[PDB]
Amino acid sequence: GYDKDLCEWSMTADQTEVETQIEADIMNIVKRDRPEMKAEVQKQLKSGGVMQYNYVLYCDKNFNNKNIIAEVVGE
Ligand SMILES: [Ca+2]
């Protein structure tokens, strides 16, 4: 997804600050769309990191954030 202010914050704020909110944003989508996947997605975020989603979640006009679960659990 894209939002001008969220895009700028995600690219300028402290690394740990953005990383913590990315995880919370993903878990919120998991709770809404695949609530039983909470423990599994949490395990995948810890092993694979979340900062690789810095661009697609806040700066990408061509990424639908609903697809973040499939992105995380896929290879
Ligand atoms: Ca992965």
Numbering used by the authors: 23 to 97
Copy text from the publication.
In 2002, we determined the crystal structure of gp5 that showed that gp5 consists of three domains: an N-terminal OB-fold (Oligonucleotide/Oligosaccharide-Binding fold, gp5OB-fold, residues 1–129), a lysozyme domain (gp5Lys, residues 174–339), and a needle-like C-terminal β-helical domain (gp5β, residues 389–575). Combining all our results with previous work on gene sp and 5 mutants, we propose that the main function of the Spackle protein gp61.3 is to inhibit “free” copies of gp5 that are not incorporated into the virion during T4 particle assembly and thus can escape into the periplasm.
It contains 5 α-helices: helix 1 (26–34), helix 2 (37–55), helix 3 (57–70), helix 4 (73–75) and helix 5 (87–95) that are connected by short loop linkers. There are three gp61.3 monomers in the crystallographic asymmetric unit. Barring different rotamers, their structures are nearly identical. In two of the three gp61.3 molecules contained in the crystallographic asymmetric unit, a calcium ion is coordinated by several water molecules and the main chain hydroxyl groups of residues Val94 and Glu97. The thiol groups of two cysteine residues Cys29 and Cys81 are close in space, but not close enough to form a proper disulfide bond. As a global average of billions of molecules comprising the crystal, the crystallographic electron density most likely depicts a superposition of the conformation with a disulfide bond (which has a length of 2.05 Å) and a vast number of conformations in which the thiol groups are greater than the Van der Waals distance away from each other.
